[PDB]
């Protein structure tokens, strides 16, 4: 399935060295400005060695820059695309308090947030309401990721940008929520 199909996304890693990965169904898209074929559809099983679909993902800011992929009750930890030894692990064992079957996750420019239904959890290396602390973000999200100064929340075929300093959905034109394909990816018309 093409990156620019306009279908919803399942998960995104965090922006690392100008690149990230999007997940949809059985597909991994590497989003990098440098790519020869940018957003070439690769199978998750071929790139990451695990079955899709994946629930959520995040990448850590630190120099190792480990990527975490979540599916059901388990998570996998990667370095330079290689699975670390003794993964997968149980979410319950690695992330005390975090539930199974998360909707989305992001790591902040060290804090990770997990999203499930109307709630989110803060994890550092007690649930709160998304719409209370993330001003403009609706209850439930499909996926999330962190940039340098903003975070992005994905819901169906649309997304929100939240400024980190104010934790408010930014005022833009046309307003959030708006098309991922058109305004986030800059897909061809
Ligand atoms: Ca998801
Ligand atoms: Cl995600
Ligand atoms: Cl940003
Ligand atoms: Na994410």
Resolution of this model in Å is: 2.0
- Angle, alpha carbons 148-153-159 (nearest 5°): 105
Chain position carrying tokens 């790591």 = 107
Method in brief: X-ray
Closest CA to 15 of 176, 150, 163, 186: 150
Cα–Cα distances in angstroms (integers) from residue 91 to residues 99, 105, 123, in the given order: 7, 13, 12
What ranges in 56-179 are assigned the alpha helix state H? 91-94, 130-133
Q: Report the distance separating Cα 13 and Cα 15, nearest Å.
A: 7
Identify the nearest ligand to the CA of 20 by its number: 4
Identify the nearest ligand to the CA of 58 by its number: 4
Q: Report the distance separating Cα 23 and Cα 30, nearest Å.
A: 9
Q: Report the distance separating Cα 54 and Cα 109, nearest Å.
A: 23
Cα 4 to middle of ligand 4, angstroms: 19
Instruction: Calculate the dihedral angle through the C-alpha atoms of 94, 100, 103, 109, rounding to the nearest 10 degrees.
Output: -10
Print burial letters for 109-148: b (CB count within 10 Å at least 16), e (below 16): eeebbbbbeeebbebeeeeeebeeebebbeebbbbbbbee
Cα 149 to middle of ligand 1, angstroms: 22
């Amino acid at each position: 399935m093409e990156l620019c199909s306009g279908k919803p996304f399942d998960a995104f890693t965090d922006l690392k060295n100008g690149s990230l990965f999007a997940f949809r169904g059985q597909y991994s898209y590497e989003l990098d400005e440098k790519a020869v074929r940018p957003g070439y559809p690769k199978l998750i099983r071929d790139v990451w060695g695990i079955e899709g679909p994946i629930d959520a993902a995040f990448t850590r800011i630190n120099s190792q820059g480990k990527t975490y992929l979540f599916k059901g009750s388990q998570y996998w930890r990667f370095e330079d695309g290689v699975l670390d030894p003794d993964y997968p692990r149980n979410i319950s064992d690695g992330f005390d308090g975090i539930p199974d079957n998360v909707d989305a996750a992001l790591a902040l420019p060290e804090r990770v947030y997990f999203f499930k239904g109307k709630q989110y959890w803060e994890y550092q290396f007690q649930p709160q309401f998304i719409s209370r602390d993330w001003h403009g973000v609706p209850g439930q999200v499909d996926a999330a990721m962190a940039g340098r100064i903003s975070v992005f929340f994905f819901s169906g075929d649309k997304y929100y940008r939240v400024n980190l300093r104010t934790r408010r959905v930014d005022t833009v034109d046309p307003p959030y929520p708006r098309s991922i394909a058109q305004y986030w990816l800059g897909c061809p018309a």
